[PDB]
Amino acid sequence: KNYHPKIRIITQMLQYHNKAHLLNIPSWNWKEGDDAICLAELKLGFIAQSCLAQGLSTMLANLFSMRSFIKIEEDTWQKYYLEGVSNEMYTEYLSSAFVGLSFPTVCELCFVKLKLLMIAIEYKSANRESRILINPGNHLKIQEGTLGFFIASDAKEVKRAFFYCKACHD
Amino acid sequence: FDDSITTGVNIPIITELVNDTNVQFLDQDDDDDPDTELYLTQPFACGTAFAVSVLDSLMSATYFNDNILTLIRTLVTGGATPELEALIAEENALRGGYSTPQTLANRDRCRVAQLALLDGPFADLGDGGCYGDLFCKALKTYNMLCFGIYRLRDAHLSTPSQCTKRYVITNPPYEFELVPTDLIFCL
Amino acid sequence: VKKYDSTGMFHWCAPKEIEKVILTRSEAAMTVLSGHVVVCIFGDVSSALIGLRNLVMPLRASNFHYHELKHIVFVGSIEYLKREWETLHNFPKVSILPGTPLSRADLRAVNINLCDMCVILSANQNNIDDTSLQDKECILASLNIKSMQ
């Protein structure tokens, strides 16, 4: 960051207590892409979620890997599994048609119509303080400019949320 | 164990592994030569063996989409706002407050748990109903996302046994007939 | 009674045993420290002595008055400073705070915003692994203090 203080960097850490030192560098802006990956926070977090619902250590660890979609035919516990190993988290901006709708109406309109599962939104409370909200209830409505966190098998199908309107796509 | 094995093998455990070839040794039902890679094995597919090396693919996935490491950080640490991560960085461990009614709005964002299709108002759909009916009615009535089934290994009629090993399937379609032995990943 | 170290060239006191000068994070908060010196020692029980006799002694010269002498606070491991204290115990106005000089709790407990100098010393093993990766604990401590508010 001395040599070029605009570059995006991505760092693996080994402890959690000393990824606070990366805040002290003045060029380090995590809002621009400088995200450090802690390994003792995510390993002991995926295990701590499996104490709540067993399987989330491999529910999540298949959602960020480009898995080789081979097709098994005769087997039964591996055929149902490998159809669920090609699903990945993609982001796409919501279209203008969703504005004003509540969150549970949107996920219904994404899964019934688009055949996309939508897990979370990015609520613009502030442009410098934008929280990320997994599955809110009826308290929220979709703003123009909330980012849609999807789960899909293809990068093509996730673009169809930006093209949802009540004229021809519906 | 006493009856007053109870589960014995069916105690649910999870194991971190330093290596990845050692995933063969956790179960006695494996068919795994030492090049069947780590996502295909049974102890990883059932969710009982979390090696660290499946997080080496995360920084390739973080580079292509920036909001990918921030979606699994929250979901997983629970809280972990940077306003809270700074306060842990300041002096010590956590510090207590006196529960003002806006910090009590920080509660009840999302619980993460799984529940069964053996009782409740879902068993009428959880015996023969399509999964796409189950997902729509949970948001419509109870407002929770059904994002995965924790399928038992021998739900297919394969000489019914006491194998309680359940594997994980992620986001099944509007189709995909249920079995009453299933468990549902909800929020 | 009289403490001016018979040469007549530095300052002197009674030989303090080490427990009298130890502070904690709550004790040094009540101690008003201003215009003082915070020395950050990165040490170990096994690392070599840097000889803090040579640091305190020019700051205890007889050329200054006892109401002027700057209070010295060492921030480091006590397992290092148990070794050092035999060479320091006749000097006035010296406190030791246990704790690493990377926790900001220990740097706020000594009120580092009011100090006259924050000396950061690498008392550790030197030439451990590389050339440039030697003083990495001294760079992170200086980046730590320049980022506090």
Swiss-Prot record, chain A:
Region (Segment S8): 101-121
Record region (Segment S7): 44-64
Post-translational modification: Phosphorylated. Phosphorylation by kinases such as PKA and/or PKG. In smooth muscles, phosphorylation affects its activity. Palmitoylation by ZDHHC22 and ZDHHC23 within the intracellular linker between the S0 and S1 transmembrane domains regulates localization to the plasma membrane. Depalmitoylated by LYPLA1 and LYPLAL1, leading to retard exit from the trans-Golgi network.
Tissues expressing the protein: Widely expressed. Except in myocytes, it is almost ubiquitously expressed.
Effect recorded for C168S: Loss of heme-induced channel inhibition
Compartments where found: Cell membrane
Region feature (Heme-binding motif): 165-169
Coiled-coil portions: none
Function: Potassium channel activated by both membrane depolarization or increase in cytosolic Ca(2+) that mediates export of K(+). It is also activated by the concentration of cytosolic Mg(2+). Its activation dampens the excitatory events that elevate the cytosolic Ca(2+) concentration and/or depolarize the cell membrane. It therefore contributes to repolarization of the membrane potential.
Family note: Belongs to the potassium channel family. Calcium-activated (TC 1.A.1.3) subfamily. KCa1.1/KCNMA1 sub-subfamily.
Annotated disorder: Paroxysmal non-kinesigenic dyskinesia 3 with or without generalized epilepsy: An autosomal dominant neurologic disorder characterized by absence seizures, generalized tonic-clonic seizures, paroxysmal nonkinesigenic dyskinesia and involuntary dystonic or choreiform movements. Onset is usually in childhood. Patients may have seizures only, dyskinesia only, or both. Epilepsy, idiopathic generalized 16: An autosomal dominant form of idiopathic generalized epilepsy, a disorder characterized by recurring generalized seizures in the absence of detectable brain lesions and/or metabolic abnormalities. Generalized seizures arise diffusely and simultaneously from both hemispheres of the brain. Seizure types include juvenile myoclonic seizures, absence seizures, and generalized tonic-clonic seizures. EIG16 is characterized by onset of seizures soon after birth or in the first years of life.
Domain notes: The S0 segment is essential for the modulation by the accessory beta subunits KCNMB1, KCNMB2, KCNMB3 and KCNMB4. The S4 segment, which is characterized by a series of positively charged amino acids at every third position, is part of the voltage-sensor.
Subunit-level organization: Homotetramer; which constitutes the calcium-activated potassium channel. Interacts with RAB11B. Interacts with beta subunits KCNMB1, KCNMB2, KCNMB3 and KCNMB4. Interacts with gamma subunits LRRC26, LRRC38, LRRC52 and LRRC55. Beta and gamma subunits are accessory, and modulate its activity.
Additional observations: The protein was initially thought to contain two functionally distinct parts: The core channel (from the N-terminus to the S9 segment) that mediates the channel activity, and the cytoplasmic tail (from the S9 segment to the C-terminus) that mediates the calcium sensing. The situation is however more complex, since the core channel also contains binding sites for Ca(2+) and Mg(2+).
Record protein name field: Calcium-activated potassium channel subunit alpha-1
Shown stretch of the complete protein: 513 to 682 of 1236
